[PDB]
Every structure is written in C-alpha cells, then in structure tokens.
C-alpha cells in the first residue's frame, strides 16, 4: 500500500534512461545495507483449487486462499496469523486453534509438504542478520501472473517479480527506495533506485525495471477507484 | 509456470 510511491520511484528511474548514458556506473549504486528482510522463496499456484501457497525466506509459509482470506504459519511452528477479507487479522496458534480453521490449516500443511520435497529456496545461501524479527511478518496481499512472470505483492509494500524463462528476479522495496536483482546465476545485489537514476545501469536491469513499472501500474489499477471492476 | 523452481531448504 506503498504502491503509489513505488510507481513514482520507478517512473523516475525509467524516465532518466539509466541505460542511455555516456558512462554507465551501476556498481556505484550498489548498497548492500538495503537488502530486504523478506522475499518469497517458494510458491505453488493451486488457484484452481484452494489458492496460492508460498514460503518466505525466513521459512514461514502462507496461503492466499481463493476466498481472499490469508493464513500464515510462523517459523516457530506454532504461531498463526489469519487475515480476513477486510484486512482484520487474528493471531493464534496451532495448538489451541479454532475448529473453524481446521480445513485451512490442513491445506496450509498440504502446501508446506509439497514445497519441502520438490521446490528450491530462492536465495537460500544468504545469511540473515540478527533480527530478522518483525514486523508480524508480511502476508501476501495480492498476486498475478503474466505470460512472462509471476507478480507477488507483500503487505509491507515490497513487490516481487519472478521471470519464468531465465529464473531472474526483482525485489522492489519502496520505503528504502531500493531494488534487489537476482541474476541468472542467482547472485544478489541491492541498488538504490535514486543512485541508478544518477549513474545509470545495464540494459539487463533497465528492461526489467521498465517491466516492473508496467506491472506495478497493473496493481494500482486493480479494483482501484476509477474502475472497481478493474 | 504453476509451481516455482524445482529440486530439493529449510522447512
Ligand atoms: Ni488441530
Ligand atoms: Ni512429487
Ligand atoms: Ni530454466
């Protein structure tokens, strides 16, 4: 819900033509201190039946069910967050859970088992900093797919884009105003978008930042006020 | 395309 600022940030960088410079200095835009705490490490699109399951990099798991409710299991193996359609959020546990979440918890379990045995953890080899604690963990607000990508919007404002063909990824964060690019070799770097405007960047990243703008634009216009039917 | 990248971290 910091989508508007992100759009403003992406528009800025794209309008500066970061790849159309005398000398491109992408390396000077790196800022390793801006690495995100959270991103999506795994996902399963079972949207024909039940919903979209995903794992965050801290090993927590979530499901955005088809009825637009969300269930989150923390990495403590016991803590649950349930987020209703309206955004209300309940916090609870697996040991003392309402009988009413039995179906949904069982489904989360099924998603969890599928993803431990067959999916890879994106960004598995990165060492987290002490805390990584906070804040209540993000949940999946919305997601969509294109021919080229899956688009994942988290409740802390981050927008993640996974490109299908080459396995490259963007993690965009609007508060830090930064973007993390995971390349074909799975290497990660974080850039300040404002320094990319300043020093430019390679065509590989620039094209992807242009695609990110159009995708972020699609998110804002989804069920927006101009057209609640989209 | 319907699941993410396959093969074999960390619960
Ligand atoms: Ni039970
Ligand atoms: Ni199998
Ligand atoms: Ni491939």
Author numbering:
A (entry chain C): 372 to 601
B (entry chain D): 148 to 155, 157 to 159
Published text:
One of CSFs, Emi2 (also known as F-box only protein 43) inhibits APC/C activity by binding to APC/C-cdc20; therefore, Emi2 blocks the ubiquitin-mediated proteolysis of MPF8910. Subsequently, the phosphorylated threonines in Emi2 can be recognized by Plk1, which undergoes phosphorylation, and these phosphorylated sites serve as a recognition site for SCF, another class of ubiquitin ligases; SCF destabilizes Emi2 and activates APC/C10. In this study, one of our aim was to elucidate recognition of Emi2 by the Polo-box domain (PBD) of Plk1 using X-ray crystallography and biochemical characterization. To elucidate the detailed molecular mechanism of recognition of Emi2 by Plk1-PBD, we determined structure of the complexes of PBD domain (367–603 of Plk1) with peptides Emi2146–177 or Emi2169–177.
We synthesized two phosphothreonine-containing peptides spanning the amino acid positions 146–177 and 169–177 of Emi2, where two threonines (Thr152 and Thr176) were phosphorylated, and their binding affinity for Plk1-PBD was measured by isothermal titration calorimetry (ITC). The peptide Emi2146–177, which contains phospho-Thr152 and phospho-Thr176, showed higher binding affinity (Kd = 1.73 μM) than did the peptide 169–177 (which has a single phosphothreonine: Thr176), which had a Kd value of 29.58 μM. ITC results suggested that the phosphopeptide 146–177 can bind to two Plk1-PBDs simultaneously (n = 0.47, expressed as a ratio of Emi2146–177 to Plk1-PBD), whereas phosphopeptide 169–177 binds an equimolar amount of Plk1-PBD (n = 0.92, expressed as a ratio of Emi2169–177 to Plk1-PBD). When a threefold excess of Plk1-PBD was mixed with Emi2146–177, most of Plk1 was eluted in peaks corresponding to 60 kDa. These results show that both phosphothreonine-containing motifs near Thr152 or Thr176 can recruit Plk1-PBD. First, we crystallized Plk1-PBD with Emi2146–177, which has two phosphothreonine residues (Thr152 and Thr176) and solved the complex’s structure at 2.4 Å. Although ITC and SEC-MALS indicated that the phosphorylated Emi2146–177 peptides can bind two PBDs simultaneously, only one binding event between the PBD and a phosphopeptide observed in an asymmetric unit in the crystal structure. We examined the structure of the Plk1-PBD·Emi2146–177 complex containing various complexes of Plk1-PBD with cdc25 originated peptide or chemical 4j, and we found that Emi2′s peptide-binding characteristics in relation to Plk1-PBD are similar to those previously reported for phosphopeptides (especially closely related to the Plk1-cdc25c structure). One considerable difference with the previous findings in the complex of Plk1-PBD with Emi2146–177 is that the extra electron density corresponds to Asp157, Val158, and Val159 bound to a negatively charged surface patch of Plk1-PBD (left in circle). In addition, the negatively charged patch interacts with Asp157, Val158, and Val159 of Emi2, which also lie in the conserved region.
